[PDB]
Amino acid sequence: AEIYNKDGNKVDLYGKAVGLHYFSKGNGENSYGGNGDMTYARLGFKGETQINSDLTGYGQWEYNFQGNNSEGADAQTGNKTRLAFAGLKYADVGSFDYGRNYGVVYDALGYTDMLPEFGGDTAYSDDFFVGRVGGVATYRNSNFFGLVDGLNFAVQYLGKNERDTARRSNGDGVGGSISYEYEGFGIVGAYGAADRTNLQEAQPLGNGKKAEQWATGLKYDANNIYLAANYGETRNATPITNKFTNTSGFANKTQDVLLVAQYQFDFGLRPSIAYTKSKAKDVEGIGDVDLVNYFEVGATYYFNKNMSTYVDYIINQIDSDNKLGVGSDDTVAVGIVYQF
Amino acid sequence: AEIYNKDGNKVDLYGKAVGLHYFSKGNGENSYGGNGDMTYARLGFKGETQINSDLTGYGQWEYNFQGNNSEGADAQTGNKTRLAFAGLKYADVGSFDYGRNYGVVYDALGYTDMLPEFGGDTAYSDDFFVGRVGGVATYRNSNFFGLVDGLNFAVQYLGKNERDTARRSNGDGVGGSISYEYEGFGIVGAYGAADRTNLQEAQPLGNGKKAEQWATGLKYDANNIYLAANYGETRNATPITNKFTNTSGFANKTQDVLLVAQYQFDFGLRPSIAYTKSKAKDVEGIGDVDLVNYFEVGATYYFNKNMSTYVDYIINQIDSDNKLGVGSDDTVAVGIVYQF
Amino acid sequence: AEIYNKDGNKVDLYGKAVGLHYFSKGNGENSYGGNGDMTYARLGFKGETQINSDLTGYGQWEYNFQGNNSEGADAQTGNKTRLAFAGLKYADVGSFDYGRNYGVVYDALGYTDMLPEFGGDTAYSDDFFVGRVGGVATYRNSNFFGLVDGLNFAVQYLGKNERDTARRSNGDGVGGSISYEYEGFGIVGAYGAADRTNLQEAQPLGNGKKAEQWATGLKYDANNIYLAANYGETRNATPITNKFTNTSGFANKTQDVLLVAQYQFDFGLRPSIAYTKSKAKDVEGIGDVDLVNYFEVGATYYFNKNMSTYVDYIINQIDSDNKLGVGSDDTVAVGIVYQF
Amino acid sequence: SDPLEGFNRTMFNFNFNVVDPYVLRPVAVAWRDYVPQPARNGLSNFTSNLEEPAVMVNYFLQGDPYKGMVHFTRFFLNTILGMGGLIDVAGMANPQLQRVEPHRFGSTLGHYGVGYGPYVQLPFYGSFTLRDEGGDMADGLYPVLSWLTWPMSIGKWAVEGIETRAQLLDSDGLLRQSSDPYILMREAYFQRHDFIAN
Amino acid sequence: SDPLEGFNRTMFNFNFNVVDPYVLRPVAVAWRDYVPQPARNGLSNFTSNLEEPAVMVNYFLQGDPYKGMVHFTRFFLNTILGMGGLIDVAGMANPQLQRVEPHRFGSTLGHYGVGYGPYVQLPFYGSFTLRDEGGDMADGLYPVLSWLTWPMSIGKWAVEGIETRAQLLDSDGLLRQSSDPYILMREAYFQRHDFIAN
Amino acid sequence: RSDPLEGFNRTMFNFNFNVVDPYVLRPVAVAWRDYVPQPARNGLSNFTSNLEEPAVMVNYFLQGDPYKGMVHFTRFFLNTILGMGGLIDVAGMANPQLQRVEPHRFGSTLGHYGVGYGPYVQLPFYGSFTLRDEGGDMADGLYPVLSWLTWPMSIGKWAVEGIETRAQLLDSDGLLRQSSDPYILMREAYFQRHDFIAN
Numbered sequence A, B, C: 001a002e003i004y005n006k007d008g009n010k011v012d013l014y015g016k017a018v019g020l021h022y023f024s025k026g027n028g029e030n031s032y033g034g035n036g037d038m039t040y041a042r043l044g045f046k047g048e049t050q051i052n053s054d055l056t057g058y059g060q061w062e063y064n065f066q067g068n069n070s071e072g073a074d075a076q077t078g079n080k081t082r083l084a085f086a087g088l089k090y091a092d093v094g095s096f097d098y099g100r101n102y103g104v105v106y107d108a109l110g111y112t113d114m115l116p117e118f119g120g121d122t123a124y125s126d127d128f129f130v131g132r133v134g135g136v137a138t139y140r141n142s143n144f145f146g147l148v149d150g151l152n153f154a155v156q157y158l159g160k161n162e163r164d165t166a167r168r169s170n171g172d173g174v175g176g177s178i179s180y181e182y183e184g185f186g187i188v189g190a191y192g193a194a195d196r197t198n199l200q201e202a203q204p205l206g207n208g209k210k211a212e213q214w215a216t217g218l219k220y221d222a223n224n225i226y227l228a229a230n231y232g233e234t235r236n237a238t239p240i241t242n243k244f245t246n247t248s249g250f251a252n253k254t255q256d257v258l259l260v261a262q263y264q265f266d267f268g269l270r271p272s273i274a275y276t277k278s279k280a281k282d283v284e285g286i287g288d289v290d291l292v293n294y295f296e297v298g299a300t301y302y303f304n305k306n307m308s309t310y311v312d313y314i315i316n317q318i319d320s321d322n323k324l325g326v327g328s329d330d331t332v333a334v335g336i337v338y339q340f
Numbered sequence D, E: 001s002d003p004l005e006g007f008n009r010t011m012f013n014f015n016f017n018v019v020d021p022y023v024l025r026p027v028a029v030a031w032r033d034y035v036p037q038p039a040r041n042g043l044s045n046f047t048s049n050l051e052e053p054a055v056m057v058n059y060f061l062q063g064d065p066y067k068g069m070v071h072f073t074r075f076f077l078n079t080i081l082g083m084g085g086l087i088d089v090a091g092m093a094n095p096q097l098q099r100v101e102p103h104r105f106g107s108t109l110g111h112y113g114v115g116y117g118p119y120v121q122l123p124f125y126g127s128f129t130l131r132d133e134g135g136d137m138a139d140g141l142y143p144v145l146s147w148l149t150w151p152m153s154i155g156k157w158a159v160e161g162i163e164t165r166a167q168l169l170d171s172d173g174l175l176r177q178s179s180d181p182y183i184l185m186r187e188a189y190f191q192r193h194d195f196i197a198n
Numbered sequence F: 001r002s003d004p005l006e007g008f009n010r011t012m013f014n015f016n017f018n019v020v021d022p023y024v025l026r027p028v029a030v031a032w033r034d035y036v037p038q039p040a041r042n043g044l045s046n047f048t049s050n051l052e053e054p055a056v057m058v059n060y061f062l063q064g065d066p067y068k069g070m071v072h073f074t075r076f077f078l079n080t081i082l083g084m085g086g087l088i089d090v091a092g093m094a095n096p097q098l099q100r101v102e103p104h105r106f107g108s109t110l111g112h113y114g115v116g117y118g119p120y121v122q123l124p125f126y127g128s129f130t131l132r133d134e135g136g137d138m139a140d141g142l143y144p145v146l147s148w149l150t151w152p153m154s155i156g157k158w159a160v161e162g163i164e165t166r167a168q169l170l171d172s173d174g175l176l177r178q179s180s181d182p183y184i185l186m187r188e189a190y191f192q193r194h195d196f197i198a199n
């Protein structure tokens, strides 16, 4: 919602309130996604200042308030800042923004992150270059300096965050992406690599000097149809956890598949189906092991640009004895979403 | 403050900055409300989208930032999300909203919740049906499908929130309310009942499978007068705490009275006086015992619709030797309130 | 950004997104300011209601979201409410506001608090009268009841905040400031004194019943030039910490100097140079010891009133063997800032 | 060709003349008299919802996924948002989603050309053919309609029937003023059940 | 009728003269001279605040709770917001809240019709009646006025007096230019004190 | 003025003008403007001009115009940090008073306090050279930025800066062949630019 536009500065202040609720066998401990209330709300701004003919300056901040907590001891459980960065867009020669922002290998994984509530399984937050991440300087450039329309590249440096948990820490890394979009089709490729911190080196699971993730993607977005594929491999980056030994760490290798197909009906309903399989290879003391594996059928019904409601049902394929303990039961979500 | 209204979607963003300060004898450990600075601020949005002739969509999010904290280790003390829900209003056949929202029995207790700073003592937050609460589907219907003007009913389902503390937990429950308002008078009645979680069972105080609370109310709101009465009984729901044995849990029965009388002068001052008595029955190891007992004489002064200032004086009747350890001293508050 | 002005009430909703990054030797434990990502964002409202010709009511709330945190366990580190107050401004008989607000001795310390990223080292948050602090009633009166232009005084009462850490606590205090500004020059004097809480007494460093801070300042702000000097002494107030013994507390005495000289070029660049030396006196087991000592040269470049970018270089003079363990290495920061 | 006309007429005389005037019609008055309007269409809202998944199944079985996905939305919005079927939200939403006649497995059978065999006419039930009445009962072999008990089903059947009968409290003259009420009756079943079979 | 009138004249000559020209009038010069306006009406702001609860008490005692609740607001807003009574926020707020003359227990006696008995005139005090001066002292039996110490009360009596003496420093002619200066003084005490009990 | 090595400089100018220009520089300066894209070309000329900016700032200070010096500091600041390590000229897209100009290095400061060039010389492959500027400029390789480049790095900077000016001038060729004395025109253009820089 653009709530300010005066003297060459427009301020979009947006947010949502999502009444969410999950359903899984038992108390949902062994399930794919959980059980119970999942209500949340978000609140953010995008700012945008016209400096002059060439320069545009922008800054974005986006936060997640949770609504399934009590007003007591656990009140802030799961509150977080999802994005906060500033940057500069120059005339024809691209854009440069440093802050908390999306990793570059998300440029590929975004292809298959279209599901109503689930999906996007391999785009782990705070995991180097896939999904969001802190301290990233990103240069992006669309239509190749004005010379080749549809062709975009982005290249990004990952500033080291050495935190208290190995899960949420990273060394220095560099990475980039390229995409071509031509008449409804989209090809995309992303690759980044980065040093692992000393604390990540010392984890029972995952071993190696450098982490690297890459992903590629096909898509077809045209004619009320959406098809998308993503394939990607990681070395020493996809976080894992053996719930049997209560160790954690990183997968030594993962081979990831993501497929999406959805159609948008003229009356409002956008049914979707998905398949995901993230296979981990050479996990310490385990070997090969599936981290993710499912078919998803779901639907969002759009009342308009401000109100919507969905059902997302996961058919979980993860086994009863997935050695890392990855949960195997099915999960289904129901949401009503007001967004502004 | 309505800060957006374009294309059949309005966005109300509101807040307040309340300078609060309590005064109690000593450090206020044995007082009604405590001693010292109690300053806080709130921020929320109310959303509302006209889908078409019949459907309206709404969403609300409201948060509480505290201002009596330091910027240090305790910075989040008491910062919490009060409300976060979305929903749909159907032409005449009512309204349906799921999220963190008020329980159904607040429909009755609101009658007596008008005081400048205190009061509303039996509407505990995260306490089943009487205050705000997670995973609540609420169906409300006003003026009975267009047939009976002044007659509103509500019925609400409470999905289990199995939290870490029994203070903030509940099993699955259902409840409803009815009110008739006819020319300034108002009657109301509400009742809810809900399974108790295993952890609430294992508490030293309170014993039983199901919790239930109900309350009723008379009011007269007309010609600058406000009169309001509430009576209510709870079984195994009012959370209590034995300050002597340092056990806690729930009162096995409570019988609760609240009376309000306030008059609004044309020059801005709205004095109020109230009476509150929550008596506990059949407490483990105690028996009958008072949880709440006071007279309040107080006043809110209204500068305009944006600024106000109040003093709320509690005359505490809880005894010096309350066997549950309830505090027995007086508390007086002074507030200055900017809201938009 | 004034996002509402209707019925004599204007509501400014403001914020910023600052992409920050510090550079210091090594892991930056011995630094002035640290090493790595420092991204953060702010969000606030300032309120204002015209009651009539004389009375106007106001309210302000400001929060700091950090963006250098993870989305996991440490998500709220350093998130805080910086301000929350309400008040009344009377025609010519001054202004009175209660809440979390700046201490009165900041009326002097602000003079030299002009650097792009650093400086203002003596304006500790939650430290009695020199910076933000909870429960302060502040009365200010500009141009001496309309009679003496340029002459402002303010007088403030500090309600005791007895918090869990001695670092963040204070007893009851009173304090005031006076400033004269006449054609670009500005002289100022501020002084506060306050009871110390019992826990501040039981700390290894610092001993005494009453804490006090005073500071004065000369400044020259005119013709694109800024000069500012501050001198100030504190008794029992400046928090200190011996990194060797892992004891902490309060300095017994301090003598504080701050110098700033900055110039604004017409083409956009605002260089600055500064000098700061906060020397501690009468430290337990140590004696005299430097808390702060640097030359700073830095510069902000302004794209317009909404976008800016700065670099701040601290030339640290603290010794390799500062007896209290104050880190000695240099730090430099670089920021890009979008604000609305 | 109506092979059992002699039995079916003996039974239509049974239904048209003893069980309608002495049972149904008074019930439909006290229904329309003492039952409020929101109640009545709220019940027809609620019972048609329970057929909606079976309609969605068979529109797919016949080869029209658009109708099926239209009927999925009907069940989805009505059950989840609009109060378990009591409220028709998938209708206040889009005009393309407004309620229609049920397409069950009887329609699917004929849509591939099967045939009714003989027509029959049962006391208290009325019109029945093997293909539709009965062939429709296959949709009680998979969710929603499988969740109803035998008393739930006879009440759903009876609540729906009393409602259709109460709407026609004045179209009676259109049936008393025809020379052959039976052949107008028999011809109205094959009227609807063949449009349903497209 | 003034029974002790002969004593009152001998003390009025004392108060109007010898104690006015040689003491009072010099002090009232240095008051308007060296004291600024923000100080004076800010001091009058602060001294009037302390009677507000006693005015509130007696307005209730007289039977118009509207008047009393206005003075509760006066005290409320002034002490809390307007700087301990120094700033009149309950006055800049609503027109209906402006400061007025005090109604103390002397008025409550008169509103129930109590003769003053005799009028008297004391050295240094000035005008006094058993009913009002004295009946006014009754409000020191309950908060605010009961909180004052003997040093506190005599200063309040003295500074408020200096202000009243300094404001009238030039209307002296209406009393110098009257054939009878005393009896308008005696009757001006009964002028002010009789309208207050209405 | 007076050109003492004129016989040598002419012999080497015939070298540069008539064999190393037509047989080496000029073909490469063609393939430059042929196969290198414009964002690449002015992006590299953005990037090499960037590294002289701190030494220009040093030297504008040494000459006594801190205003110019701080203008060139900003050039370096905005371009290096924001505009992608110098590749993008944001301190120019920002203010007009910040646009790129000729470099003033330590050759300029020397002349600004008035020291002769000594003799003019013309080296093969270098072209115009004087002790004061070509060479006297090398003192700015004694302190930040330019002090950071290696022998392969710096001669490449000289080479890309050179190929660009030659490729920008690929059609002004007639203006130098069609003069009775190309040498005295090239030599007087060396004293032209290097005298404007010392103003």
Ligand SMILES: N[C@H]1[C@H](OC[C@H]2O[C@H](OP(=O)(O)O)[C@H](N)[C@H](O)[C@@H]2O)O[C@H](CO[C@]2(C(=O)O)C[C@@H](O[C@]3(C(=O)O)C[C@@H](O)[C@@H](O)[C@@H]([C@H](O)CO)O3)[C@@H](O)[C@@H]([C@H](O)CO)O2)[C@@H](OP(=O)(O)O)[C@@H]1O
Pocket (backbone or CB within 6 Å): C193, C207, C208, C209, C210, C211, C235, C236, C252, C253
């Ligand atoms: N402003 C000077 C400051 O004074 C103030 C208070 O004095 C009055 O308190 P009283 O004791 O009469 O009840 C009064 N209430 C008034 O409101 C002021 O608040 O004092 C210091 C130094 O005072 C000393 C002295 O002669 O050196 C030292 C005091 O002790 C120290 C201590 O450790 O013993 C050291 C300080 O670091 C500090 O911790 C103080 C605490 O405030 C203790 O309360 O204690 C103490 O012995 C006092 C005696 O009370 C004197 O009666 O004397 C002075 O500093 P300077 O650098 O030496 O000039 C301030 O200028």
Ligand SMILES: CCCCCCCCOCCOCCOCCOCCO
Pocket (backbone or CB within 6 Å): A019, A020, A021, A024, A025, A026, A027, A334, A335, A336, B098, B137, B158, B159, B160, B172
């Ligand atoms: C958006 C509206 C959604 C509101 C629905 C909340 C309903 C909460 O009830 C949960 C129903 O499931 C209860 C299951 O009972 C225990 C079963 O545990 C074993 C599972 O097989």
Ligand SMILES: CCCCCCCCOCCOCCOCCOCCO
Pocket (backbone or CB within 6 Å): A093, A139, A145, A155, F039, F040, F042, F043, F046, F084, F087, F088, F089
């Ligand atoms: C024709 C009139 C103006 C003259 C043009 C000046 C052009 C200067 O700006 C162009 C800069 O753009 C170069 C882009 O180079 C790529 C940078 O990003 C590479 C990623 O590492």
Ligand SMILES: [Ca+2]
Pocket (backbone or CB within 6 Å): A206, A207, A208, A235, A236, A251, A252, A253
């Ligand atoms: Ca490995």
Ligand SMILES: [Ca+2]
Pocket (backbone or CB within 6 Å): B207, B208, B236, B252
């Ligand atoms: Ca029980």
Ligand SMILES: [Ca+2]
Pocket (backbone or CB within 6 Å): C206, C207, C208, C236, C251, C252, C253
């Ligand atoms: Ca001390």
